[PDB]
Symmetry: C3
Subunit: 296 residues, 3 copies
């Protein structure tokens, strides 16, 4: 039995097809069983239509054995492109083994595994091409766009394995395949999926800033395009045309890294923002606000 | 010597360049030697121009040793994208070893091998991404479009290895590369190539139906778009707007699977077709006709 | 540690980020340390803007350890898409180990390694798909287009690893990644980089011919589209509409191979050119001129 054939077969029982159907449309994605109680992780694109139109869409989970079971949305995070479903009272679930994405290295051989019974399902193979790679993701429909620190791989990521797991050579989940490919790292998945299970919602920091990327010999980074009124950046002293070069402890190369670095800040705590303003370096102090004040 | 280098070198003598030339045009593809008498298998796209315009096109086979030899069309099957050529009285041919595509599993490492002396020739590597995957194929010019149960692979399939073999790690042919890539499985190739050698033609079942894919919460499958007059479906009771969900022993997910499932039926024998008609499940009995009545 | 993880980690210290910046723009590529004195090889596309606009662009080299150092252009060859930079008085450089591209075989596993600290950096994996493959390359801006005998690979070649090394399983450089991917072979790199270091310039043969590819049953090859006045082909007897089929000791399949074969000729020495002229085979004798008369 082939080296990858063994790994793909070892995780197949833990990967599921996620099907949302109305009486006029129907889409399919993949997900991974992450808890014996019936919790399933996918990406926010796979469920986007059912989450946004729950009156007309019904979501089911199809297992490796062919069983079809109703599924309910536990919670979703368009900002990290993650979501959690729940199947109730399903016995003998084969829960996937979650790895540690902090131990993943460039060159590691990986499999991007889609649901074995999906219509256009795929299983692809490659290596890890980059780590902590900020990548912009387009929201599927009415979902807002976002940027994530992704694991980059030259394994093909497509409709046939979107939402399925990125698997290392120990048959462990190291990532969730997004919609030259990218995956949400499993350690960030664990944090997001746990809070979506405790709270049904994730609260992310916000500053009230929109940026555009700039790269030149003076000052490269994320140039402040807009500051919202009454925003944390508004009170912290951030001004337009400022070129943000550092957010907290993370240097910011462009707008993509800016979005990701902001989400690493602590809500309600002072934090430094370094900018280049009219050719002058300036450090500012900002207290991020929660993006969802009622859930915080 | 590399693991894949050994396999690619082991099959090179069995892979040939197929060149068809007129006095104003010329194209190249790949093929594989499948019988010591000089029979060579390629896909129907590679020869399409010479088969359709034999008065102006001449076809030759170029071997690994550089020998160039005239080739004649034994037969072709646009419906399975397969074709057989013949070289006459060529000695010491290195016949390829044909595998068993029913033993191929998802994750198996494969090589998509093009003719070593072809102009744009390639050899690519990947894994098997899916099995029994219905894929639509566009006829090259005046050839009719078709759908086949393919082996899907993330090994690149391109002009440089089209018509060449898909090779497993035992240096065995498990498929024929088509024109994210697909290959005709070798077991289906054997059946088609044998009949093209006995009969010079393949006879496929037909029902007289055109379908369009549908996917919703009521009834997903292949919706009947048209029924030909006097067709087997016409006498079997199939009506327009019927959503076919099963053909024989094979469930039908969409139009792609419908085309493939029909070709698995027995000519002249009764067979069940399950449909959803105005929200009502109905089973029908159809006797498929041969698509080529004179060869049958 | 993974098989490819070890190789990628072993060469990382020898791969550098190459950053050219003006006060309004900035681009990044990869390069490889090839000599302890501080010589770095990249492709001509990576530096194209700084080489063409040196008054406004500044080039730096970023090492694996994060050190940033000024770099100076030693020389470039748009015709082979190669270039050499120099860092001065940098100690403890990890020089890459240069392989022998003549020992590379089809199917060899390779890594296309980009600079570890580059913004969009990638490391991709594949096999060698073809050897001595003439490929046309578009000049980046005002640089002239060219054709090279490349190593073809199904490892992804992109902006994130352009200019970085193509690495074999012995952690040796066998090629330079260009801008389904292609790399300049290391043996041709050695010749070009050495002359760019001795002379600051490379001198290539020229005949004064422009060709277009032709492929038919009469005569396939590179059809002479234009002959420059006073050119070596002009004095050698080459005429328009001639279909060149051999240049020196190398048969010419199309215009791509013609460009490459011409560059293999000896400057100032008689050489045969075989053509098909009005359906008649004709051999001609041409004495190539240097493309840069003052440097020759």
């Amino acid at each position: 039995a082939g080296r990858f054939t063994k790994v793909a077969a070892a995780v197949a029982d833990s990967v599921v097809t996620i099907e949302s159907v109305s009486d006029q449309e129907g889409m399919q994605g993949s997900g991974v069983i992450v808890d014996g109680r019936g919790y399933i992780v996918t990406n926010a694109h796979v469920i986007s239509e059912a989450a946004n139109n729950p009156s007309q869409f019904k979501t089911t989970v199809v297992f490796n054995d062919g069983k079809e079971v109703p599924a309910n949305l536990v919670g979703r995070d368009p900002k990290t492109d993650l979501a959690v479903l729940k199947v109730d009272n399903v016995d003998n679930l084969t829960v996937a083994r979650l790895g540690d994405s902090s131990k993943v290295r460039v060159g590691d051989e990986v499999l991007a595994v889609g649901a074995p019974l999906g219509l256009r399902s795929t299983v692809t193979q490659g290596i890890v091409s980059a780590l902590h790679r900020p990548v912009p993701l387009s929201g599927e429909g009415s979902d807002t766009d976002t940027v994530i620190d992704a694991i980059q791989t030259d394994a093909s990521i497509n409709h046939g394995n979107s939402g399925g797991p990125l698997i290392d050579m120990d048959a462990q989940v190291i990532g969730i395949n997004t919609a030259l490919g990218f995956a949400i790292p499993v350690n960030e998945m664990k944090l997001v999926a746990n809070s979506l299970i405790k709270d049904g919602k994730i609260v992310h920091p916000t500053l009230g800033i929109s940026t555009r990327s700039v790269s030149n010999a003076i000052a490269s980074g994320a140039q402040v395009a807009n500051v919202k009124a009454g925003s944390p950046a508004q009170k912290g002293g951030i001004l337009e045309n400022d070129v943000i070069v550092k957010v907290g402890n993370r240097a910011v190369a462009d707008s993509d890294e800016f979005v990701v670095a902001v989400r690493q800040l602590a809500i309600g705590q002072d934090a430094p923002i370094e900018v280049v303003r009219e050719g002058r370096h300036v450090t500012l102090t900002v207290k991020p606000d929660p993006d969802s004040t009622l859930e915080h």
